Amino acid sequence: MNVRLCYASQRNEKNEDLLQDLRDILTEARDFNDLNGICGVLYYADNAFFQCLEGEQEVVERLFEKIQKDQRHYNIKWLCTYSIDEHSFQRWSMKYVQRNTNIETFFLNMGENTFNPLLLNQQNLKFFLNELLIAEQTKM
Numbered sequence: 001m002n003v004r005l006c007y008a009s010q011r012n013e014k015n016e017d018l019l020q021d022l023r024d025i026l027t028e029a030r031d032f033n034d035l036n037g038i039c040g041v042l043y044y045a046d047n048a049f050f051q052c053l054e055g056e057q058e059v060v061e062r063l064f065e066k067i068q069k070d071q072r073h074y075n076i077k078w079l080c081t082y083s084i085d086e087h088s089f090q091r092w093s094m095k096y097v098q099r100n101t102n103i104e105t106f107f108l109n110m111g112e113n114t115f116n117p118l119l120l121n122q123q124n125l126k127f128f129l130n131e132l133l134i135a136e137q138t139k140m
């Protein structure tokens with residue numbers, strides 16, 4: 001089974017150098033994901049991560065277990081795991097997306113002015129993933 005797994009987490013602010021942490025996370029993620037048949041997107045804004053992992057169920061669940069142990073975030077909240085009929089994020093071992101006015105417009109239009117993916121219902125999380133898919137990747 002191929003699956004998409006999504007979660008949200010909090011930036012651990014004990015870590016002072018966020019810019020280097022994001023570089024390190026994306027370096028590690030792109031290396032491992034490429035070697036293990038995983039793709040997806042990492043969204044970062046307002047001290048919170050949202051990630052979607054796509055790939056074979058066992059490798060994706062194993063990677064999510066490893067990510068839970070990572071001291072660069074805390075308060076990991078699993079949002080969904082479902083089987084997928086297409087790999088939407090196959091262009092990227094790990095796409096990087098930051099907040100932009102289109103994503104802010106998306107949240108405002110559906111009434112969620114916190115811009116917090118953790119608050120989205122199943123349908124709105126699918127729409128949020130669409131925004132992350134069409135967003136121009138942020139070059140790190």
Ligand SMILES: Cc1cc2nc3c(=O)[nH]c(=O)nc-3n(C[C@H](O)[C@H](O)[C@H](O)COP(=O)(O)O)c2cc1C
Pocket residue numbers: 009025028029030032033042049051053063066067068069070072073094
């Ligand atoms: C928000 C976030 C997202 C991450 N995404 C991935 C990823 O997609 N793939 C990956 O291999 N590592 C990712 N990591 C990194 C792993 O958690 C990190 O490389 C791992 O802790 C190294 O584990 P090890 O010491 O067992 O090698 C991520 C880390 C964070 C904080």
